Design a protein around this nucleic acid. Sequence first.
RNA 1: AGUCGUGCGUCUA
Length: 690
Amino acid sequence: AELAKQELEHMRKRLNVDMNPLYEIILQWDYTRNSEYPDDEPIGNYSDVKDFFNSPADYQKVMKPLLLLESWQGLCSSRDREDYKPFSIIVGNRTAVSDFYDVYASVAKQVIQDCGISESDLIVMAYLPDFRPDKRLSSDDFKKAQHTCLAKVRTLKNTKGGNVDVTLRIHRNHSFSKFLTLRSEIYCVKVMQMTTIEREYSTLEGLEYYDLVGQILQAKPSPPVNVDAAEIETVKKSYKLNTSQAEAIVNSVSKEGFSLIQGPPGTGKTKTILGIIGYFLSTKQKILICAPSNAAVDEICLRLKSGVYDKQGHQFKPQLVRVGRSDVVNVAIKDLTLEELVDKRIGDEMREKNSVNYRNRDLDRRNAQAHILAVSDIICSTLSGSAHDVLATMGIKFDTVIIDEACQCTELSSIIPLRYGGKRCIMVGDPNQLPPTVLSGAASNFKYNQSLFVRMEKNSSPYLLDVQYRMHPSISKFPSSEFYQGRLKDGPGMDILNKRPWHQLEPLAPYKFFDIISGRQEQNAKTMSYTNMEEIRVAIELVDYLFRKFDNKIDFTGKIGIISPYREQMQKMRKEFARYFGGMINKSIDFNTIDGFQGQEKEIILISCVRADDTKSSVGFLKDFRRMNVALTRAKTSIWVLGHQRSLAKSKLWRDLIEDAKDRSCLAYACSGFLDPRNNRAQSILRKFN
RNA sequence: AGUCGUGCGUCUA
């Protein structure tokens, strides 16, 4: 019918968005340029993310500059932080494609294999006649190179002699093409991969044809639909969920469109997702789960492998498909990956026969993967991975799209999976958690860091999960009072936690705040990261005391986690712990940054604050409330907060936290050798500070 | 203001 034809055309347009404008915009940039913005255009062009968008054209106009700025910042970060291995190529004939030049170059297979150049990688090319052959070429030369040109890899054709033909796409108007003479050596170095940027741009362009385009532009969730309480109670009993969680799931499923579920950490977010999936399956309807990071996808796959109960209580295990590489995905998820499933399902005359056999094998693999995708019910992947070419070729509509950590991903990433005719979308995320990853502070200033879920929450209040179990009630007290503004209720196990010990002792309590009377932090110019020795010494002393108290009674294998805002501080702590304790720190203690440590929960969490000097009133990342909430919510039983008293007291949120700790008598002055009575200096300092 | 998630492909003479 006409409607079917229109839907097919819209799907084809969404899945076949041309990338030429993106290439034209990107290639005009100068690699050697060192500025906060790709060009020198007036700042007025950039605009903050509007809450309401009049039409798709305005939304695209607002978003495109932000995407370009983010891409430029990522390019600069790759140029500076990372130094890819340079290589050299020989220029060939040039083809004048529409507003582009495609250059064919011959390169060695070993060189590209070592560098790691794929068909969707961006490179920067330069001509260095004075470059000595023996000189160690590096990204510094490219940055300081007089002439540079951005190029995009198009095709990689292998040919006898180990010769790879590479088609590089460059901007036609770029002057560097005058140096692209036949049989000319050009030094090229990789910059970054454009696959994610290309997918985001395609989604931005195709948002017009999206079914939920109106809802996204308005950002208004569909009105709640009343449901019978008896059905909610029956679902809760069948799935063994909580009353609030069951009500939220029922309300989200009943209404068609975007659904907002605010799950604070420890509120069974994975359990809530499992319940939603089971309820939807009980009521083929493919469901696409997308998560910002591969770790979340792996966790969801592991949880699903155990099976999901239905309303009747009969556990079942729908075929789950993981769209991801084996190396990036967890080892346990290797079996669930598409490649392994296809392999399991499958189980010059000679030259021609070998070629025919290879083609037949490729066709069989394509057929097997297509069949698996068609029969699969649950497809778990990442936001960027949801737009994989295989899925686009399949063109199978996904009625239900679940988004995890909606507050940890950008709007474009969240909308990417919706391209496959997504009529029902369920986004779950906690705004108090870490904001979506952003490389540019300027982009954040334009509200680019703000995600779609944030606007949806502003328009309408999501269904906050009040009940939490893993988090200790004392730990969740202050976040509930301030971060969540209440609406949090402790679970039945308020004080019946299995890890009872190391709590009765006065020195060790569920929540503590051991400030440092004196502490000096040194900043490294190369990394611009502060490092303090007092925090490291205090943490080492506390860990040693804890181990001595329970060296043999209880094993701390994967139960102690030290987190600091700064990467350099965490690395220094890991090095010191390895030097002092030895190899036992590999498993007993886990060292990682607060942002990196997100998603991991441990019995004991040591939150070490590096900001100690009071000379500068600036607070830094500690000022943000979301980071503090993430740091505090990752603990279960014991929290050890380390940081200078005055520096933290400068901030309003930290001042309130210190006041609450004083009210709860959780403040205890600490310094070097706090638990070392032999060192009389520490005791004297503590007495004087009193 | 000092840190970070995301992507790629495995047989070719």
